[PDB]
């Protein structure tokens, strides 16, 4: 192979190459324009080491504290039906909606797999909204809490247009911790310094900065606790209450054991109360530690009261629900509420005990915040240019591979040298005529008709020294062009003033009578079977100038009919009343009709389809004719088209 | 291949090579002369360590303090409409204008994307100026502050000529910090000393030194709540763009691309280049006609042309080849159109006529023949009218004025050219003419396109093909020869036409004037 | 040997190839579930 070949192949397949490259580049464009952007925020902290501090920042205690502070276990996402609706909304300049939610409690179905309950909220106006979990529709109002059907929800400052939908998921705490940890990173940048760089990536440019600020504040507060925790009585205060709290816990367990030795609503309310009691407990402990280290008018401090206000109102209505319940169920719940709350608060005190101990051994001087977290407005993902470049290069590489594949899988004839190497004379090369009528009559100036005239002048010389004036056209495979070539060649030889007879000896699928305008009665079959005379079968072509004999009715025994001596009698008779006789035949690989006819023909030519047939099929057809005692003069390549890879020049261009 | 071949190819393509390299060099020089210069300023700090210190210098607190001090969030850009106007203005020696603005507040449109509000100020004089944000035109004066339409602005010391325009942008604080951080670098220079080198790059030689001084002062003051050895100075020689390396890369790139393009053009030619290619196949080349740089016969207008000399050489070759021919009919044909068959035939007829022999030229290109145009004509009764039977043999023969030979024009274009030529009247005409003339030359259409030449060649004693020098390939000529042979016509040989001088050829013609 | 021969062999033996690969994938799915 050489460079000319590959360049020609590329030029020939240019449309396919362009299509494939364009489709991959379009997909890369679509992805790099619809993938959700990802922003990144960072902060800088000063430490007076730094190897264990890196591990302590990514511990579950710090992250859990910040999640509880910022209430990150309430996942809110705008509803778009397709996997591209969000991208379309962003490109159209539409402002994404957002809702501030401060209290959520789903009924917590908590089946085997779906551990994350979720509801859908539809915005009806600036104030009210609709809520549906599994078709249970409820109406809610911003401001006032909703506590119905074991569902608690508080919605504040709806900022969206009416008709929008939002999915609200209440995912478990560990899931939130894992989600945050996946996107959070810590570094030293110097491997020795007291400088810490914190990094956080996420899709909301403000939420991530708030989260990173909360993490920094929690770390600073935790580490500087030792400054005044040494003299703080809380340590002993923990040492005092902890044995005591266990005492009623044991009592609560034993009493429940005594009574034990399943109402759906009761456990639904029981858990909700237990959650409310928990929410109150750490909130007071949270509100405790905020009080020393912050001011009452500070926005964090003011926040806890309405949160405390919210919890108490929820509990109060919860107590209303219990009071409306039978005392038989109420008795169990009071035992259960005591057991659950006591066990829950016991763990919390153990947690708080463990937390303060770590502050004791914290060697770090205190903390210092050099740079509070800020977010880079230019997203870090997706990286558009690299995606586009990869898409284009991938398109090119797959196009080249596919085209080279098709090149190495090609077997059809491409140029007459392939036939001429075997030793087959190619007498013509007919191009495709892009123009039930004879081409040589409808459009006499077509390129294919010019090539056929070239064939005519070749034949006028080849058929000299012929045994007689009979020419048989055949082929290897069907629909190679035998009827086309034969009919048009007859037309062109007739227009030169010689009498021509065309015989459609394809008794199986011959349609020449259709293409000439016909009297289909008394074709060739009716003559051979003996029920017609030699004069009733010859008909005149209208736009031609030559006679023809049609096949007639399809016989059941085509091959055996052609062996009747009447066929040779007909040929010998016609050879004295005409200058040329052209016989069209079925293929030779399919049936044996052509080999029977060829015994009576002075000249025989094969037709090879340009791209379909292969060299071997033509060779095999030549051999099969030879074994039956018929000498094939040569071949006619038909259906040629322009291939830049050829480097073979035809005259298939207009000259006039 | 050898070195001589490639040197010849380079010499031949020298025009393209020089043009491409010149274009690349011109772009390199324009870039190296129009890119805005970038200066470097530096300072030296002593630390009484230094690993955290590079991180503390590049912190947002220090840079933010400097930015607030120097109002680096007020970006002023002198307005030049093109992406090169600033470069020309600098090259033309024009002094760049500048404005001192000490307090600025735009209404902060703050849409989804354009977080950077900006206005345009046009200088009217040394005192007053015009301001436009979105078509809102206002007039202000240096000195007195302006508080109008949510736009508040104070200008001091406009230093420019009237008519100038300036873009004033109020970009966000973080954007300014990031921009400053891009241009600011800290290095240790000893990896152990308390010495730090601070570096800052920028386009204004004085502003960057002031900025670096502010950074050093803010750092030093912050630490004492660290020693400045060398305050910031600006190197007057710009560090970018590096002109000489840009120009060298441009030149080398030009040479590389020129050479590679020449290698493609060499490897992608297929045309004939010398008669040796045809003679490898076994085709006699009887002549090689060069391009004649000079609606008239060349062999009459400029009888001393080089091409006519080559044609005379062909004439003497023919006078020997055409002996023992079955008659005195010569047919010139070719592989592809516009190869030169009409040119060769007509001029050859002229040169054979000037030697005192009677010559008949038959234009048997019944499809695109124009010989009668080139000879001066009575276009009535061409060859078509004779073949179709509506003219006799004696009304079709015409006399060339400046020639000395007769001709037969095609006549009206018939609808069935190839079928006409099969009529026996054609052979009757040739038999009659062969007894009244010394030589008959027949011009024909190409053979790959139509089949007329193969019909005519049966009655021609000699046949010759014409191949254009660079256009046709060896394959086309071989195919044409085989197609003629299939139809029973023996081609004597070939004629290479349209040659030009190629240094890479290493094959020498005699195409030079001698006289 | 050439690419055409091997491609033809795969095309002819497609029934066996598909059957074997499907059996192995089915066992993989059963184990994975
Ligand atoms: N060079 C060609 N250009 C345009 N149409 C062609 C060409 N060769 C064959 N055909 C058309 O394609 C079809 C197949 O050719 P046909 O001779 O009828 O089949 P078969 O060779 O088996 O007898 C026909 O409709 C024919 O008209
Ligand atoms: N060696 C040549 N020098 C200058 N002009 C030439 C030469 N050969 C051919 N031509 C001109 O180029 C054009 C094409 O040649 P022409 O013989 O008319 O076409 P065709 O080969 O199809 O008959 C003509 O205008 C001819 O005058
Ligand atoms: Mg057929
Ligand atoms: Mg011509």
Q: Which ligand is nearest to the CA of A510?
A: 3
In whole angstroms, what separates CA A420 from the centre of its chain? 49
Structure-block tokens of residue B435: 């007894």
Q: Whose CA is nearest to atom 19 of ligand 1?
A: A479
Task: Please name the chains neighbouring A, where neighbouring means 3+ C-beta pairs under 8 angstroms.
Answer: B, C
List the one residue out of B274, B208, B175 whose CA is nearest residue A377: B175
Q: Is A219 annotated as a binding residue?
A: no
- Yes or no: say if A542 and A625 are a contact pair by the CB < 8 Å rule: no
3+ Cβ–Cβ pairs closer than 8 Å linking B and A? yes
Number of the ligand closest to the Cα of B444: 4
CA distance between the termini of chain C: 43
Strands (E), B348-478: 359-363, 398-399, 406-408, 439-443, 462-468
B60 contacts in A (CB within 8 Å)?
44, 370-371, 374
Q: What are the Cα distances from residue A440, in Å, to A430, A484, A505, B375?
A: 13, 10, 21, 36
Could you say which ligand is closest to the alpha carbon of residue A655? Answer: 2
Tell me the C-alpha distance between A472 and A462, whole Å. Answer: 14
Coil, strand, or helix at residue C26?
A: helix
Name the maximum alpha-carbon separation found in chain C: 43
> Are B311 and B344 a contacting pair, CB within 8 Å?
yes
For residue A93, give the nearest of B112, B419, B450 by CB distance: B112
B interface with A, Cβ–Cβ below 8 Å: 51-52, 55-56, 59-61, 112, 115, 174-175, 178, 267-268, 270, 335-337, 367-368, 413, 415-416, 418-419, 422, 445-451, 454-455, 473, 475-476, 479, 483, 486-488
Distance from CA of B88 to the nearest CA of A (A): 32
B228 preceded by a cis bond (ω within 30 of 0)? no
What is the maximum span of chain B, computed from C-alpha positions, in angstroms? Answer: 125
CA dist., res. A433 & res. A138, Å (int): 73
Instruction: Give the A-side interface with C, CB within 8 Å.
Output: 408-409, 411
Is residue A583 a contact partner of residue A512, using CB atoms and an 8 Å limit?
Answer: no
Q: Indicate the top mutation candidate among B293, B340, B480 to test ligand 2's pocket, ranked by most ligand atoms within 8 A of CB.
A: B340
Q: What is the rounded CA–CA span in Å between residue A116 and residue A113?
A: 9
* Dist. CA A471–CA A581, nearest whole Å: 6
A-to-B residue pairs, Cβ atoms closer than 8 angstroms = 94
Going from the Cα of B339 to the center of ligand 4, the distance in angstroms, rounded, reads 8
* CA neighbor of A430 nearest in space, from A488, A474, A374, A383: A488
Residue of A nearest to B456 (CA): A457
Q: Which of A484, A490, A508, A585 most suits a substitution to test ligand 1, by most atoms within 8 Å of the C-beta?
A: A484
Q: Which residues of C touch A411 (CB under 8 A)?
A: 4
**Which residues of chain C does A408 touch, with a Cβ-Cβ cutoff of 8 Å?**
3-4
The strand pairing partners of A604, in sequence order, are A472
Cα(A616) to ligand 4 centroid in Å equals 41
Task: Choose, out of A454, A634, A635, A644, the residue to mutate when testing the contact with B (most B CBs < 10 Å).
Answer: A454
- B243-267 and B3-12 helices, crossing angle to 10°: 110
CA-nearest residue to C5 within chain A is: A409
- Could you identify the residue written with the tokens 């240094």? B503
The ligand that comes nearest to the alpha carbon of residue A484 is 1
Edge-to-edge strand list for the sheet holding B39-46:
B184-187, B195-202, B39-46, B227-234
Tell me the three state secondary structure of residue B103.
Answer: strand
Q: Distance (Å) from the C-alpha of residue C28 to the closest C-alpha of chain A?
A: 23
Residue B102 among known ligand-binding residues: no
Cα A432 to averaged position of ligand 1 atoms, centre (Å): 9
- Alpha-carbon gap, residue A11 to A367, rounded angstroms: 69
CA distance B423 to B408: 17
Dihedral over Cα of A169, A170, A174, A176: its sign = positive
Q: Which of B371, B354, B335 is nearest to B468 (CA)?
A: B335
Other beta carbons less than 10 A from residue A325's beta carbon: 14
> Quick check: A474 and A588 in contact, CB under 8 A?
yes
- Determination method here? cryo-EM
Please, are residues A124 and A162 in contact by the beta-carbon 8 Å criterion? yes
What's the token pair of residue A259? Answer: 């009574």
A479 is an annotated ligand-binding site residue: yes
* Phi-psi sector, A320: left (phi>0), alpha (psi -120 to 50), beta: alpha
3-class secondary-structure state, position B158:
strand
Q: Decide: B302 and B294 in contact? Cβ < 8 Å.
A: yes
- Quickly count: other Cβ atoms within 10 Å of residue B474's Cβ: 17
Q: What is the resolution in angstroms?
A: 2.7
Axis crossing angle, helix A264-293 with helix A60-70, rounded to the nearest 10? 100
Output A158-162 pairs: Cβ under 8 A, ≥24 positions apart.
A158/A99, A158/A123, A158/A126, A158/A127, A158/A129, A159/A97, A159/A98, A159/A99, A159/A100, A160/A97, A160/A98, A160/A99, A160/A123, A161/A97, A161/A123, A162/A123, A162/A124, A162/A125, A162/A126
Sorted by sequence, the CB contacts under 8 Å of residue B279 that are 6+ apart come out as B285
Task: Say how far apart CA B359 and CA B407 lie, in whole Å.
Answer: 8
Where is chain C discontinuous (C–N over 2.5 Å), named by the preceding residue? Answer: none
Which residues from A are below 8 Å from C10, CB to CB?
Answer: none
* Through-space distance between the first and last CA atoms of chain A, rounded to whole angstroms: 38
A72, A116, A505, A629, B458 from A596: Cα distances, Å: 91, 83, 11, 10, 36
Structure tokens given for A394: 């991938």
- Rounded to a whole number of angstroms, the distance from the CA of C7 to the nearest CA of chain A is 9
Is-contact B487 B515, C-beta < 8 A? Answer: no
Take residue B7 and report the two structure tokens written for it. 């040197």
For the record, the structure tokens of A379 come out as 């997203």
Contact residues, chain A, for C11 at CB < 8 Å? none
Task: Quote the tokens at residue B202.
Answer: 């920028």
Closest atom of ligand 1 to A511 CA is 18
From first CA to last CA, the distance across chain B in angstroms is: 38
Q: What does each C-alpha distance from B85 to A11, A159, B36, B97 come to in angstroms? A: 43, 48, 11, 14
State yes or no: A427 annotated in a binding site. Answer: no
Task: State how far the alpha carbon of A176 is from the alpha carbons of A74, A215, A263, in Å.
Answer: 9, 14, 31
> What does the block give as tokens for B369?
């023949």
Structure tokens at A439: 């081409």
In sequence order, what are the residues at sequence separation of 6 or more whose Cβ sits closer than 8 angstroms to the Cβ of residue A139?
Answer: A128, A129, A130, A131
Quick one: A192 exposed, middle or buried, by C-beta within 10 A (0-12, 13-18, 19+)?
exposed
Q: Find, among A119, A114, A110, the residue nearest to A76 by Cα.
A: A119
Which DSSP string do the residues of B486-500 spell out, in sequence order? HTT----EEEEEEE-
Is the Cα dihedral A418, A424, A430, A436 positive or negative?
negative
Residues 6+ apart with CB under 8 A from A263: A325, A329
Residues contacting ligand 2 via CB (< 6 Å): B 289, 291-292, 307, 334, 337-343, 497-498
Please report the DSSP string for B60-102 in residue order.
HHHHHHHHHHHTTTEEEEE--SSSSHHHHHHHTTPPPPEEEEE
- Tell me how far CA of residue B155 lies from CA of B108, B117, B144, B162, B310, in angstroms: 19, 18, 8, 15, 85
Residue A589, token pair as written in the block: 């690989």
Q: What is the distance between the alpha carbons of residues B234 and B200, in angstroms, rounded to a whole number?
A: 9
- φ/ψ of A27, rounded to 5, equals -65, -40
B486 Cβ neighbours under 8 A, 6+ residues apart: A425, A427, A458, A461, A462
Neighbours of C, requiring at least 3 CB pairs below 8 Å, are: A
B–C touching, 3+ CB–CB pairs within 8 Å: no
Cβ neighbours of A360 (radius 10 Å) = 11
SS3 call for B270: coil
Q: How far is A279 from chain B (nearest CA, A)?
A: 38
Nearest to B487 by CA among A433, A295, A456: A456
Distance from CA of B97 to the nearest CA of A (A): 32
Please spell the DSSP secondary structure of A522-568, one letter per residue. Answer: S-HHHHHTTSS-TTSSEEE-SSSSSEEE---SPPS-HHHHTTSHHHH
Are A3 and B268 an interchain contact pair (Cβ–Cβ within 8 Å)?
Answer: yes
Ligand 1: list residues with CB < 6 Å.
A 430, 432-433, 448, 475, 478-484, 638-639
State which residue of chain C sits closest to A405, comparing Cα positions. Answer: C3
Question: Do A24 and A402 contact (CB within 8 A), yes or no?
Answer: no
A581: part of which helix (H) or strand (E)?
Answer: strand A580-584
Torsion B99-B103-B105-B110 (CA) sign:
positive
What CA–CA distance (Å, rounded) separates A449 from A431? 9
- Residue length of chain C: 33
Q: Which residues of B touch A444 (CB under 8 A)?
A: 415-416
Report which ligand 1 atom has the smallest distance to the Cα of A587.
22
Half-sphere exposure of A288 (CA within 13 A, CB side): 8
How far is C-alpha B210 from the chain's CA centre? 49
**B381 CB-side CA count, 13 A:** 11
Scan for tokens 């046009």, then name that residue.
Answer: B122
Q: How far is CA A649 from CA A652, B274, B307, B311, B468, in A?
A: 8, 20, 28, 28, 15
How far from chain centre, in Å, is Cα B355?
A: 49
Contacts C3 to A, Cβ<8 Å: 408-409
Q: Is residue B158 within 8 Å of residue B99, measured between CB atoms? A: yes
In angstroms, what separates the C-alpha of A376 from chain B's closest C-alpha? 8
If DSSP codes are grouped into helix, strand and coil, which group holds residue B388?
Answer: coil
The tokens describing A377, both together, are: 């407005």
The chain C residue lying nearest A406, using CA atoms, is: C4
Name the residue among A380, A329, A18 with its Cα closest to residue A202: A380
Closest CA relative to residue A518, chosen from A494, A534, A502: A502
Task: Give the 3-state secondary structure of residue A336.
Answer: helix
Give A454's contacts in chain B (Cβ within 8 Å).
450-451, 454, 483
Q: What is the dihedral of CA A403, A407, A412, A415, to 10 degrees?
A: 110
Question: How many beta-carbon contacts under 8 Å exist across A and C?
Answer: 6
Q: What is the token pair recorded at A566?
A: 């009447």
Pick the residue of A649, A650, A653 with the most B CBs within 10 A to test the interface with B by mutation: A649
Q: Phi then psi for A198, rounded to 5 degrees?
A: -105, 135
Q: Which ligand is nearest to the CA of B374?
A: 2
- Nearest CA-CA partner of A104 in A127, A87, A121, A84: A121
Distance B387 CA to ligand 3 centre (A): 37
Q: A441: which 2 tokens?
A: 């009559």
Q: How many CB atoms lie within 10 A of CB B159?
A: 12
Token pair belonging to B461 = 């004693």
Q: A96, A98, A103: which is closest to A143 by C-alpha?
A: A103
Nearest CA-CA partner of B151 in B138, B164, B142, B167:
B138
State the Cα–Cα distance between residues B503 and B7, nearest whole angstrom: 9
Contacts of B499 (CB under 8 A, 6+ apart): B288, B289, B290, B291, B469, B509, B511
């Amino acid at each position: 192979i050489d460079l000319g070949r590959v360049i020609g192949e590329l030029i020939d397949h240019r449309k396919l190459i362009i299509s494939i490259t364009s489709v991959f580049t379009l997909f890369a464009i679509l992805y790099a324009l619809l993938a959700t952007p990802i922003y990144e925020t960072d902060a800088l902290i000063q430490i007076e080491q730094s190897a264990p501090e890196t591990a302590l920042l990514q511990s579950r205690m710090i992250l859990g504290k910040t999640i509880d502070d910022l209430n990150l276990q309430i996942q809110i996402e705008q509803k778009y039906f397709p996997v591209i609706g969000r991208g379309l909304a962003r490109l159209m300049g539409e402002k994404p909606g957002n809702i501030d939610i401060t209290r959520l409690y789903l009924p917590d179905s908590d089946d085997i797999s779906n551990n994350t309950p979720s509801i859908i909220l539809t915005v009806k106006d600036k104030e009210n909204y609709s809520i549906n979990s599994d078709g249970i529709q409820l109406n809610g109002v911003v401001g006032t809490l909703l506590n119905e059907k074991g569902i608690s929800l508080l919605v504040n400052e709806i900022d969206a247009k009416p008709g929008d939908q939002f999915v609200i998921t209440q995912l478990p705490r560990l899931k939130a911790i894992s989600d945050l940890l996946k996107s959070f990173s810590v570094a030293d940048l110097g491997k020795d310094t007291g400088m810490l760089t914190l990094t956080l990536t996420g899709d909301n440019p403000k939420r991530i900065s708030h989260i990173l600020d909360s993490i920094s504040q929690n770390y600073l507060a935790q580490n500087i606790a030792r400054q005044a925790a040494q003299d703080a009585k809380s340590l002993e205060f923990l040492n005092q209450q902890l044995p005591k709290v266990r005492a009623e816990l044991d009592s609560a367990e034993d009493k429940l054991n005594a009574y034990r030795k399943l109402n759906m609503e009761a456990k639904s309310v029981l858990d909700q109360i237990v959650n409310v009691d928990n929410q109150l407990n750490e909130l007071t402990f949270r509100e405790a530690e905020v009080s020393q280290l912050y001011t009452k008018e500070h926005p964090t401090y003011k926040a806890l009261m309405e949160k405390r206000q919210t919890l108490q109102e929820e509990k109060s209505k919860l107590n209303k629900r219990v009071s409306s319940m039978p005392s038989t169920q109420q008795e169990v719940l009071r035992l259960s509420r005591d057991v659950e709350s006591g066990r829950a608060v016991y763990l919390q005190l153990l947690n708080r005990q463990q937390e303060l101990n770590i502050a004791k051994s914290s060697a770090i001087g205190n903390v210092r915040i050099i740079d509070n977290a800020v977010t880079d407005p230019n997203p870090v993902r997706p990286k558009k240019t690299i995606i586009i470049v990869i898409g284009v290069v991938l398109g090119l590489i797959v196009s080249v591979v596919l085209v080279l594949f098709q090149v190495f899988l090609r077997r059809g004839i491409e140029s007459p040298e392939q036939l001429e190497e075997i030793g087959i004379n190619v007498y013509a090369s007919i191009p495709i005529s892009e123009w039930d009528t004879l081409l040589a009559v409808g459009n006499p100036a077509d390129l294919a008709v010019e090539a056929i005239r070239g064939l005519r002048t070749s034949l006028h010389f080849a058929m000299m020294e012929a045994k007689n004036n009979v020419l048989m056209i055949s082929g290897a495979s069907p629909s190679a062009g035998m009827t086309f070539i034969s009919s048009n060649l007859a037309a062109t030889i007739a227009i030169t003033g010689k009498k021509v007879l065309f015989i459609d000896a394809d008794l199986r699928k011959g349609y020449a009578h259709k293409m000439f305008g016909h009297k289909n009665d008394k074709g060739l079959s009716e003559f051979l079977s003996g029920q017609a005379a030699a004069e009733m079968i010859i008909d005149k072509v209208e736009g031609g100038g030559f006679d023809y004999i049609g096949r007639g009715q399809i016989p059941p025994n085509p091959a055996e009919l052609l062996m009747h001596p009447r066929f040779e009698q007909l040929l010998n008779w016609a050879s004295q009343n005409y200058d040329l006789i052209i016989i069209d035949t079925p293929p030779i690989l399919a049936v044996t009709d052509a080999a029977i006819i060829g015994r009576y023909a002075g000249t025989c030519l094969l037709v090879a389809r340009f791209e379909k047939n292969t060299v071997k099929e033509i060779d095999v057809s030549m051999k099969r004719f030879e074994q039956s005692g018929v000498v094939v003069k040569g071949c006619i390549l038909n259906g040629v088209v322009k291939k830049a890879s050829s480097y073979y020049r035809y005259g298939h261009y207009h000259y006039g």
